[PDB]
Amino acid sequence: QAVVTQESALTTSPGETVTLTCRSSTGTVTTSNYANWVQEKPDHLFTGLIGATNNRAAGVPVRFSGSLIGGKAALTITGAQTEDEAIYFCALWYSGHWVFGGGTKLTVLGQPKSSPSVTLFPPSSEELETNKATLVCTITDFYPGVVTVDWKVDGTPVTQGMETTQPSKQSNNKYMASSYLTLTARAWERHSSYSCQVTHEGHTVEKSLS
Amino acid sequence: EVQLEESGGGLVTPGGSLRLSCAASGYVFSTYDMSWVRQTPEKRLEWVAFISSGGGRTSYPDTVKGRFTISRDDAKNTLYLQMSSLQSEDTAMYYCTRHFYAVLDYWGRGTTLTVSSAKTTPPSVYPLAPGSAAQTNSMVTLGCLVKGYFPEPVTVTWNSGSLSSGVHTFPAVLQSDLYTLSSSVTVPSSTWPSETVTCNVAHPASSTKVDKKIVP
Numbered sequence A: 001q002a003v004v005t006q007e008s009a010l011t012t013s014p015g016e017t018v019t020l021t022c023r024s025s026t027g028t029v030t031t032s033n034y035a036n037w038v039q040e041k042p043d044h045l046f047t048g049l050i051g052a053t054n055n056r057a058a059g060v061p062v063r064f065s066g067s068l069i070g071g072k073a074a075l076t077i078t079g080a081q082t083e084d085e086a087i088y089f090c091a092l093w094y095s096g097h098w099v100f101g102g103g104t105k106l107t108v109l110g111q112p113k114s115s116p117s118v119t120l121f122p123p124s125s126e127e128l129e130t131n132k133a134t135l136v137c138t139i140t141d142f143y144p145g146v147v148t149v150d151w152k153v154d155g156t157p158v159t160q161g162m163e164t165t166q167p168s169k170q171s172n173n174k175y176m177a178s179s180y181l182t183l184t185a186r187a188w189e190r191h192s193s194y195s196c197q198v199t200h201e202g203h204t205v206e207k208s209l210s
Numbered sequence B: 001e002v003q004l005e006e007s008g009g010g011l012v013t014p015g016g017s018l019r020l021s022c023a024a025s026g027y028v029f030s031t032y033d034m035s036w037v038r039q040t041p042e043k044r045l046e047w048v049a050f051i052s053s054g055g056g057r058t059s060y061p062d063t064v065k066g067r068f069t070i071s072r073d074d075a076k077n078t079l080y081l082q083m084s085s086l087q088s089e090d091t092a093m094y095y096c097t098r099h100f101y102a103v104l105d106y107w108g109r110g111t112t113l114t115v116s117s118a119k120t121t122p123p124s125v126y127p128l129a130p131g132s133a134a135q136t137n138s139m140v141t142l143g144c145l146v147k148g149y150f151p152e153p154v155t156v157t158w159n160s161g162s163l164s165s166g167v168h169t170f171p172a173v174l175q176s177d178l179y180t181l182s183s184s185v186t187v188p189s190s191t192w193p194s195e196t197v198t199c200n201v202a203h204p205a206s207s208t209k210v211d212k213k214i215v216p
């Protein structure tokens, strides 16, 4: 029992229509799963958009809609607005329980796109004294708010000891992210090239150090 | 009309207990069916308990099954969640939702819960200095690595308020029991290092404050 998948990211412009579905590992999505659509707006605030597959909640606007699509729940937003940029989750009623999908990021283009400005940093004299080194890859200023971060030590792809923060909404409705690759100071002393590369929009920017 | 205010969360340690509370408003709290939903650090949403109308029926998912107990006091207009035998996976924001004829529509503000076994531990602050003189141009961006604190939060201020000038601080990360975080600042290239860029880092649990001056 239980898997509910949803698109991970969709991007649309203001005025356009977007559909978002909700798939089940169970097989088909009935009306006896009450497809529900929660909205997660800037800062942990949640709102019932649509419940029981097609009932739109009071206050929710005209464009939110519920449908069943090829055995799959779907949310339509017709003529989406800037305010709709947010995370949409779906819940499906499995007789007793509720099963939630991983919710989709929804960008609606409210301002001209822009790319990151990576700034890469080397472990300070001070942290090295504790026989541990950390490099900080700081990624700011991007819209849309999705990134892909890859680290390389001496050209080989790093497959661990790296962990990145989920984008976070700047003051200017621009996003920010940080990545950390941590090494024992030994390793630091050893390799000689560290690359931080961020892929945002087909374009990859890259910062390196020796 | 509706308000759902939950509360009763804090810092507990593994094996602990905890009763969460959620209070209704401007609605006839009895009639409606009801749930608890948790929002994890990973940011997935997971459901914890289900209560019916006359508290006749209770549903839970198998990872809470037997450790959590749901209930309500119609007299007081509240939902109760009773978390027992705590385990680190339960650290998450806990929310309450009313089923409006199967439309989960009104949700609480939420109540954060942390189940760590850590100990108040102040951070270590390290300078994040440019490195080779490779001047991109007008702008130079410095930062600070605040490492090994518990619990959160940590405020991070640049040049004792004086520098608001585009600061950016990031969601902390949890590296094997302690939190780490970064704050960065861009100050024009001809201001540093001629002028001074210190970084203030205060840790209220431990009532700490560290002053790392960033030098090339």
Ligand SMILES: CO[C@H]1O[C@H](C)[C@@H](NC(=O)[C@H](O)CCO)[C@H](O)[C@@H]1O[C@H]1O[C@H](C)[C@@H](NC(=O)[C@H](O)CCO)[C@H](O)[C@@H]1OC
Residues within 6 Å of the ligand: A034, A093, A094, A095, A096, B031, B032, B033, B034, B053, B099, B100, B101, B102, B103
């Ligand atoms: C079955 O029809 C609704 O109620 C029955 C009892 C549900 N069956 C079970 O509860 C249970 O799984 C039996 C086997 O374990 C159905 O699942 C179904 O539930 C949805 O429909 C109603 C509208 C919801 N109740 C409410 O929405 C409101 O608070 C109305 C006030 O009475 C219910 O929680 C389900 O979806 C939200």
